[model samples]
Target: RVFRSADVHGDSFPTNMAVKFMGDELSKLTGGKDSIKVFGNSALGSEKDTVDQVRIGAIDMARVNGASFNEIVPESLIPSFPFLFRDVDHFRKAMYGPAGQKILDAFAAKGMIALTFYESGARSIYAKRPVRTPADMKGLKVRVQPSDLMVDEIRAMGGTPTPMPFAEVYTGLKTGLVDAAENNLPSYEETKHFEVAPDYSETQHAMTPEVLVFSKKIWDTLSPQEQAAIRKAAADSVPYYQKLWTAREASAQQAVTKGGANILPAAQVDRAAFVKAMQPLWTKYEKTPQMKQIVDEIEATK
Candidate 1:
């Protein structure tokens, strides 16, 4: 078993829960099969680098963010596009439906096997200065994830994107490395970023998803029964992880508010203006074959 740990958790909690679930499910189906180990945190390397290692069989499996997978497979970047999905309702329809499988198949063709898709809550802006509109973002430097979609989204929204590792966010806030960072409420509280950035703006611009993957090499190494068992386990845990993730976000929001983090509501934000601000990206991709196909499919579906 190859387990993945990112900078998100120092060594435990949510990630460990995922590891535990995988171990239990694999054991139940494989008759207590062995050969699995968990690597927490950066012990294995950064999320992007570790994903590359898994692709070549250097590692068996890893849990990676959707953004990093964009480099290995471009079309997977679709969901990362800002405001593409207004909320979880839209996210599920796009991801679990045909359109979602369409994107996943693109990754499989490149040697990565996606086992399950899990919730990553909503990505919102946490800033040093109070923000209620694009005017507030003028001249602000914001940290962006590895995805060009996000970097592009930031710029499209009129803010500068400062690419940096997750570990650096706190210090980034401390030394004025960036004026703000955007992520889910859970992540904002987990990293204790509120200490430096107290104002939380609910742009809820992006809905992030956790991608669970296994290398084609490692996948093939397992016996048919073992593979089936792993697949079953993964599928069974989807709703479970989704629930856990949802509750985690809610709890995180409560924690942040109790801790003095100012969270703005959707009505407090001009979402149309924000959407209008991203017109350039939509225009650029609106006619692209894949984007149009996928977006049309999503729009047509319920």
Candidate 2:
């Protein structure tokens, strides 16, 4: 049996359904002799725990974001930089292209095999007050993932980076523990962050794709043909997953608007200024030549 895991609950969400779909396809391709079992809504544990489990062969597979694996594969942090991806299409062109494969290849050293990328949407800033410029962010405490690159990105933009568990963000925004946080539309709507932080700015700062990964221990146990079948199944599921993601993003935007949150226009925010502030971080974090090349190649992607 193949064990798969995801952090989200239910097939209603693309994240969960995509993995389920992959599993079904894998099972069909491998015949009834092999089957995949999926565990959703953190039934296995936090993404961090699941990744560790996969590494040691405790779990067979998992859906994880690049940020969660930055420590194990530091190069994974490149695509997540502020203003890195022009938009979702550009994200696909870059991530599904040569640059993406290189990043996936790095995972093997850490005992995981990255199968394919899934959409996570571009992230923007949401706050209790409207944030239209980098100047407005000065001294504002912003919740960020507990990663060095993320913390530095927040700081470079003139916000105080507050690293905390994702579950605490709603209360943090409600109680003024933090003045703002960043995420995509679906997350802002699904998590109900709009209830407390009613103003959102389209900073569109970062775009990180989710990865479907398998445990190397389990992967090596499979026949070469079985491995090929699983890979083909993963690739085939991309179009279906992309369609769901696009529709869900539109629905999420409408949901948040109906929830009474205001979305600030892109023109209102000084994206150039924000990029300027983050330039130092790009220099500081992307030290290796290959890492720098990946950034250039992504920018060159249409």
Candidate 3:
């Protein structure tokens, strides 16, 4: 049987390529009896919409940002907190280590399986106006993922949160539906959001891990060997995915800059001002023991 995978990213994006790599391995492992077909560019639906379908077995698998799962799998929350990791390397060290599997296992209770993780790179704020500090973002309407925590996070950063689907952000920006939005460099370039909102500030606020997840209902139908083969396929794709991510960030940065986008360097971003603004959010969400443990684990990773 063919397993369908959904991705909002374009075909050339790292996450989409990684999922496609997994599909290739799965085909080899299952001798073509089991294979995955990836539908990229949000052909299936938005991340939140696909989450619902995947849970009910409408879609066999998908790659989704960790920020999208707070309501269903709460363990994925802490990793997306503002200034959570020192950098992408720190994120890799922590996630590829112990804490990654813990959050993955948490998916079972919600009728899904987090097969493996793909880095979304660090998310940064992009807008029509130059934003050097949270003070500059005051009264701005920023588009956020459909998660309450993200909504609150943007609000804490001194902007009004406008929750919108990933696919609609470009139009939202052009139509003035939102004054700004935050995502990794690759996404900003690929979606052409830089055309509408040309000032890109390197907030690098959150490096939310995007996860490759399988429907638990579909997983239950597989034999023991099938399960092993599938898991191995997903795991084997990570190194390739991570490598592409590193390169993509560099190229995406170059592409956006050449396309007339103004980039504020990390040094000029006033991260301290942004981090200080996020203190209330950090204090509010990471108070639980579970949150503390993961936060400490990520801290100890480096």
Per-residue lDDT of model 1, residues 1-302, tens digit only: 43432323554545446745776777767666543466765577777877887888788777767887766676666777767786688888778888888777777777888877777877888897776788888888999877677788888777899877676788888999897989888789888898789899898887767777778877777788778877787777777666677788889889988998898887898788888888567556453588678867866766
Q: Provide backbone clash counts, one per model.
A: 1, 0, 0
Compose the digit string of candidate 2's lDDT tens values, residues 1-302: 65656564444668777777777887778676565677765677767778899999988888877787877787788887888887877888899999999988989989999999897998889987888777888878899877788888888777899977565677888889898999888878877889988899988888978888989998999889988988898898898889888999999999999989999988889888989988777778786898998888888888
Candidate 1 lDDT for residue 180: 92
| Clashes, model 3 | 0
TM for every model, in the order presented, reads: 0.92, 0.94, 0.97
Error of 3 at 30 (Å): 1.6
Provide the overall lDDT of each model, using Cα atoms, as 2-decimal numbers.
0.75, 0.83, 0.88
Using lDDT as the measure, the top candidate is 3
Q: Which stretches of candidate 3 lie over 4 Å from their true place?
A: none
Predicted candidate 3 versus true structure: per-residue lDDT over 1-302, tens digit per residue: 78899999888888888988888998888787777888998998999989999999998998989988987887888888889899877888888889877778889999998898888888988998888888888988999999988998888788999999899999999889897999989999999999998999988888889988899999999898988999999999999998898898999999999999999988998899888888667667775787778777877887
Error of 2 at 182 (Å): 0.7
TM-score of 3: 0.97
Angstrom error at residue 144, model 1: 0.5
